[PDB]
Write a structure and sequence with these properties.
Two copies of one chain form a homodimer.
Chain A: E1 3-6, H1 16-31, H2 33-44, H3 54-60, H4 66-87, E2 93-96, E3 101-109, E4 112-116, H5 126-138, E5 142-146, H6 157-166, E6 170-172, H7 176-185, E7 195-197, H8 202-212, E8 226-230, H9 236-247, E9 255-259, H10 262-277, H11 281-294, E10 296-299, H12 303-313, E11 317-321, H13 325-331, E12 337-340, E13 371-379, H14 381-398, H15 401-414
Parallel strand pairs in A: 4-5, 4-7, 5-6, 8-9, 8-11, 9-10, 11-12
Antiparallel strand pairs in A: 1-10, 2-3, 3-13
Helix pairs in contact in A: 1-2, 1-7, 1-8, 4-5, 4-6, 5-6, 7-8, 9-10, 10-11, 14-15
Bound molecules: 1,4-dihydronicotinamide adenine dinucleotide (2 copies) and zinc ion (2 copies).
Amino acid sequence: MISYLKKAEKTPETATAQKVVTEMLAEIQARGKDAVRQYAKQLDGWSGDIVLTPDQIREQTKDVPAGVRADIDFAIRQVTDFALAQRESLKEFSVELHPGVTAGQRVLPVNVVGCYAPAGRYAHIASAYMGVATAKAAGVKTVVACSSPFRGQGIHPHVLYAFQAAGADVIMALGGVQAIASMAYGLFTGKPADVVVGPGNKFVAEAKRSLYGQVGIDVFAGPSEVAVIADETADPAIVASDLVGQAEHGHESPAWLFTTSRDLADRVMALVPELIAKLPPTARDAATAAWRDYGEVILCGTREEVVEISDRYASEHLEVHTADLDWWLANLTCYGSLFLGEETTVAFGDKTSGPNHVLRYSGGLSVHKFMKTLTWQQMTREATRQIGQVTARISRLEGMEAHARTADDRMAKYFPNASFEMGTPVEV
Amino acid sequence: ISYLKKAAQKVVTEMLAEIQARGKDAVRQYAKQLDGWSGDIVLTPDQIREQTKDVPAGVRADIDFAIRQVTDFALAQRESLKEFSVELHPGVTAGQRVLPVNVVGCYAPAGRYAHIASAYMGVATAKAAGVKTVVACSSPFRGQGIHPHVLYAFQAAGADVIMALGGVQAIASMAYGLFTGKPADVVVGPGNKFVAEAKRSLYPSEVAVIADETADPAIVASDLVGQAEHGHESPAWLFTTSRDLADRVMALVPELIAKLPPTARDAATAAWRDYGEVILCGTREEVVEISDRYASEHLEVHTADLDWWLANLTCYGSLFLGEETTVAFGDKTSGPNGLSVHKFMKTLTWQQMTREATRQIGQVTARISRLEGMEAHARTADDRMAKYFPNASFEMGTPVEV
Ligand SMILES: NC(=O)C1=CN([C@@H]2O[C@H](COP(=O)(O)OP(=O)(O)OC[C@H]3O[C@@H](n4cnc5c(N)ncnc54)[C@H](O)[C@@H]3O)[C@@H](O)[C@H]2O)C=CC1
Ligand SMILES: NC(=O)C1=CN([C@@H]2O[C@H](COP(=O)(O)OP(=O)(O)OC[C@H]3O[C@@H](n4cnc5c(N)ncnc54)[C@H](O)[C@@H]3O)[C@@H](O)[C@H]2O)C=CC1
Ligand SMILES: [Zn+2]
Ligand SMILES: [Zn+2]
């Protein structure tokens, strides 16, 4: 019953990014800080200090009024509070296996996280604090935050205030590849980043990919998304407002509506252009192109079919304006973050960032990105009695005589007056 | 700290391009051109039973035991990532689901000089994770099927589908879901470089020993020798505070190598020479630093105060704490190449709010959005405020004009 009442009237890289990064990294590897400063001057026209001091942080944010600060403080605490809860959800343990064998999981934060904040125009303050706040909540002891200098004065003061309030340990006025590489190689700080996070342009993305591989492109990149699942009980005016909400980001921001209600679909399709029409010019232009080219509406038969299509689309941000929200929570399986019910909405902000599904399911920005699970094992002598035998035999069946001797040596040492079937030794 | 001792992928684009277009046909085509395979790819309960009747009860009991040492750990590790609900700001509920992925592909090289553990580690781990479908591939052996040891392991580990199939054909089959109609959400298993770039496009061995003066240099030597015999590119490191032990070990390794059988003797000679390393350190604190920088896939710890090392070491694949256990007894997991239950599990986060909560959250959002010049965002807050609090007048920020 899947019917595209409105369809994607467009489709979603370059080697250009690769060239620059490779050349730029090669150079920064060679020259270090001097190359970084040079790129800063050539690219950003910047000649100031790189590492901010407590005083310059305090000075450059002194015109941010108490009311703006209080709001950012509030938004940041939300992220922190979810992040602390999420950290407690990954436990350490030990377990007895074969008698005399103990095995376990240690859980520890990485030492150093680098956070980049694009601090351009059409970017949320949230981008500055989400990485930093999450890393600190994870228990990462050192967080380096970078953002390109805004208009010659330094870091955009909101971004800078957000860095400080979120708990960044070191702040640096650097943009682009040279920021990513400095954080990665530990320039200016002497603490190489175990991971680097944060959105940016193709160059920042490519820099992360090159330096970190899979843990550098596993967080949601590209333009802002929004998906809404809605049945007959949903309110079309709200639904349409929520799509238009993320569509003002730019001309490539996808806004999807999956619904089991033709009536809703029709009303939303009608309401959206009216709402766009009443935006201020910048947003009006952004949203028109955004909805025109990338807006989709999918009428489905049953709930199950909505689950299928939503899981396929795997929206970074997914609202559920339906009855029986418990069902939808229990059945949906691929999305970035879920907004259950009408009350919450995407613009209230994420608690985590979802994976880069446009490449698939794995990664994202949460405390889990900043934590290592290490496994260990330990045995009594007694336990080896059984395990040594098995390993010797299996080893000699694999043709691994050296492996077997590791068991033989232990069997000999731990059980001197004992006979054991340790397999037939390898003669080839 | 002082160093004593020191040290195509284009057929993938085409083969995939051909499998994408032609599907199952291309896989059976590629099967005879690279392996000469005639029969169907998908085995059946009978073929699996027939082909594993040659394996004795004592061998099976060994493999079964070894799988239980993996499975039982994996089961515990699965429960270590919890689902939860939490209240933040009053009336804000938020939480985390933990879901197995749907289908995992496992690939085992049926070759010799490989561990049987290769075949069961992925399969068993995926099953303990709660994954409902595990597809398992392994390259045939001279038109005679999969090595019965690999096949028995697959089955005993709890594979749902077993497919005799190799290389890029295997990976792509599993990844597109040819023969089963079930695309794997992830594929795992060692293989050749074709296998590797096949994994890269769609989606050596090691050992280290930390030891102090209380270590038994014979055992330390033997353990280094144990994994050396894999190949000429298997590193075998020693980090120690004891020059004495450092020497006796460097002395006794060659004597153990020399006493090995033919293939293993020369395998270890190259490796221990080319890649073997030794590092003497003044303090424990120093050894931690160096171990962490190397991050061995397998790391043994033969010292006093094993707790301290458990507490302070922070980078490795698998830790073997104390003398008694040893690399050869097997991993519970694989470090980064890592393989664990966590690899096969999604977290999904969600939030829900009362109307009361949006009183404060909505007006903060409207003010921030409008500083960011995001008028439409702010209007999602406005609309909620008008619907839930009809006569309210909160500071929702100055509307954007630009
Ligand atoms: N709408 C969303 O969902 C958001 C996404 N993002 C993304 O962040 C992006 C921001 O990009 P920008 O404004 O450029 O900020 P940015 O901070 O990511 O990049 C600026 C830096 O890029 C460097 N750079 C620019 N062109 C270069 C070139 N040709 N070679 C080398 N270095 C170069 C500059 O020197 C500067 O240091 C947006 O395009 C957006 O896609 C960020 C915020 C929100
Ligand atoms: N210590 C480690 O890191 C371990 C990794 N390994 C690796 O497993 C591999 C074992 O190699 P094999 O036993 O041969 O198994 P393999 O993984 O190389 O698979 C063999 C299959 O490759 C395919 N193939 C052969 N020639 C091809 C070609 N020209 N183009 C495309 N596909 C082709 C065929 O289907 C054949 O059945 C080695 O690379 C070894 O290093 C072994 C297990 C442990
Ligand atoms: Zn937004
Ligand atoms: Zn081995």
